[PDB]
Amino acid sequence: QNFKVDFLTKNCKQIYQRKKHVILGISPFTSKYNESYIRKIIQWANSNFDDFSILLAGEESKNLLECLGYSSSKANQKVRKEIKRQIRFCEDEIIKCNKTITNRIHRFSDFKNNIYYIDIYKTIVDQFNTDSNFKNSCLKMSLQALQSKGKNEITDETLEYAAQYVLAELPFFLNANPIINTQETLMAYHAPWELGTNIINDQFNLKMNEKQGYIILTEK
């Protein structure tokens, strides 16, 4: 309504049309995902869709801070502080929407012991070690993730560590449906997803599920 929506595929537009469910991806330490914006996207999700979920950064976000020169303890402290801050803003907006918070907000670290996430994560890690092209594509995303969180050095070793985050986040981008228990869903973000473009152009041994999309939200 107040957002221009772009699509990764034609199938994403078909899913979007149906308005069954959306995943609002909120990012840590980024300038965009501020109290004002976070509210906007929730009000938008709420108004247009039957249901929505929020996906916040997982534990593996420490890795990104460690690569930006942070102590393993200092990184876990900054991660906890940010996620709690994000949770408090999100919970406030969900109440304003007269919706329950219970099972609405997730982290990509929450489904570590979920059989469906375990399967998808394994299949992705296998490709990361076998497929050389995919490994590179991941490291490019790791490099962008380090840049985007540049508020407060780089080597190929640094990028393999930062890739642990990418790998952990990925199962929600390919097939979130059996993990968060949805029929069909869209992962909504503010920028395009280069890895996804390549996934969609069958460049790897991984596939984004038919009941799964990716949309780009730009403020009107």
Domain ranges of the chain: 1-220
Contact by Cβ (8 Å): 152, 68: yes
What is the residue-wise DSSP string for 84-152?
HHHHHHHHHHHHHTT---TTTEEETTTTTT-HHHHHHHHHHHHHHHH-HHHHHHHHHHHHHHHHHT---
Residue list for the binding site: 165-169, 189, 194-195
- Technique of determination: X-ray
CATH architecture of the domain formed by 1-220: 3-Layer(aba) Sandwich (3.40)
Rounded to 5 degrees, φ, ψ at 3 are -130, 130
Contact by Cβ (8 Å): 174, 206: yes
Closest by CA position to 52, among listed 211, 219, 218, 185? 185
Active site residue ranges: 27
Q: Which resolution in angstroms does this entry have?
A: 3.0
Closest by CA position to 52, among listed 106, 107, 104, 91? 104
Encoded tokens for 40: 């906007």
What is the chain's Cα-based Rg? 17
**Rounded to the nearest 10 degrees, how much is the dihedral formed by the CA atoms of 124, 175, 209, 183?**
160
Residue list for the binding site for substrate: 165-169, 189, 194-195
Distances (CA, A) of 70 to 74, 83, 146: 6, 17, 13
Encoded tokens for 191: 């920028």
Question: How many whole angstroms from its chain centre is CA 114?
Answer: 17
DSSP state of 59: G
C-alpha span between 68 and 50 (Å, rounded): 40
Beta strand pairing call for 3-7 and 21-25: unpaired
